[PDB]
Amino acid sequence: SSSVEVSSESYETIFSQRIIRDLQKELVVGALFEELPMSSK
Amino acid sequence: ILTMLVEPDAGKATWVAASTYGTDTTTGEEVKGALKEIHFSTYKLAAKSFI
């Protein structure tokens, strides 16, 4: 409880700012092919 | 005989809680062990032949 003699109200917890992704889905199809730089429909 | 001491096996150290912190229990459970002994002795082989 972090409560021996003196106390701090959760000021202490190191809110941290590091971010992450779960080995998320590899994308393999979208980029393989080539583009026909078109101008219209 | 020849007696040697075999060190006793491992005993776990307790996971104390958060309430315990700040009390005599914080120190946790005692880990206590007693050396054990192994004993060696001898037997005999003997033979006689007689010219």
DSSP code per residue over A1-41: ---BSB---S-SS---------S-----STTTS-----S--
CB atoms within 10 A of CB B21: 13
- Helix or strand or coil: residue B25? helix
- Technique behind the model: cryo-EM
Q: Greatest CA span in chain A, whole angstroms?
A: 75
Contact A4/B at CB under 8 A: yes
Reported as half-sphere exposure (CB side, CA atoms, 13 A), residue B11 has a value of: 9
Report CA-CA distances (Å) from B43 to A23, B1, B40, B46, B48: 67, 11, 10, 10, 17
Instruction: Determine, for residues B18 and A4 on separate chains, whether the beta-carbon distance falls below 8 Å.
Output: no
Residue of A nearest to B19 (CA): A1
Residue with tokens 């307790």: B14
CA distance B25 to B28: 5
At what resolution in Å was this solved? 3.4
Angle at alpha carbon of residue B14, lines to B13 and B19, rounded to 5°: 145
Contact A38/B at CB under 8 A: no
**Going by DSSP bridges, is the β-strand pair B2-6/B36-40 parallel, antiparallel, or unpaired?**
antiparallel
Chain A hits for B18, Cβ within 8 Å:
1
Contact yes or no for B6/B35 (Cβ under 8 A):
yes
